[PDB]
Structure formats: C-alpha cells, structure tokens
C-alpha cells in the first residue's frame, strides 16, 4: 500500500501562513519564512504579556507622582500615608484614574493628613 498525502502538508502550511498576515515582503508568501516569523512573534507575545504589566504599573506610578507633586508631597511619602495611617488597600491605578476625575482625588490626598 502506498500513501501520498499532499492534502495534510498543504493544510498545515496553510495554517502557518495564515497565522502571519500583515507581514512585510515575502514573510506572508513563503512558508519557511512564515514559520520563523510566527515562532518569533509568539516569543515576543510571551515576553510582552509580562513586560506590559511590568510597564503599566510604572506608568501609573509616574502619573501619580505628577499629581502629588502639585500638592506639596511626593509619591514616595504618599505610600506611607496609605499603609501605616488609615490602612487603605486602594489600588495603584485607581488612585491614578481619580485625577482624570479630580476634586474627588483631593479628598484622598488631604484625608491622609491626619
């Protein structure tokens, strides 16, 4: 018994090529390059799915530092004024968003002054 099987190979390569669309040049045409680029893209996806929560926290810190620097104290002093006194688990983003709807944030920053 002889088995040729050109169906399965083409279907597999078609899936790999379909994965990489919107790629420059031949990367979406030739399969040999498409597989390399899909592998590399998924590596980058795995690394960035961690780097982005590494970075968004930093952005929230930055936009909280800026808001507090216009009241007379720094972010590195505000965190004490949440943990030790008036123990609060308000998150590190929402205290950021509260500036985009301000004058409810000022209530926070003057509440810890007690």
């Amino acid at each position: 018994m002889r088995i040729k099987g050109g169906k399965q190979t083409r279907v597999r390569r078609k899936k790999w090529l379909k994965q990489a669309s919107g790629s420059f040049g031949t990367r979406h045409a030739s399969y040999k390059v498409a597989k390399q680029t899909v592998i590399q893209a998924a590596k980058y996806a795995y690394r960035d799915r961690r780097n982005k929560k590494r970075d968004f926290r930093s952005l929230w810190i930055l936009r909280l530092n800026a808001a507090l620097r216009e009241q007379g104290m720094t972010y590195s002093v505000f965190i004490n004024l949440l943990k030790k006194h008036n123990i609060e688990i308000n998150r590190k983003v929402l205290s950021e968003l509260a500036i985009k709807e301000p004058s409810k944030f000022n209530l926070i920053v003057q509440k810890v002054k007690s």
Binding site: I39, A45, Y46
Partner: peptide
C-alpha cells in the same frame, strides 16, 4: 480572544 502561546 485566543492566546496561542508557542515556546521554542
């Protein structure tokens, strides 16, 4: 949305 993680 599907997240298709391949490690290599």
């Amino acid at each position: 949305r599907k997240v298709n993680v391949i490690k290599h």
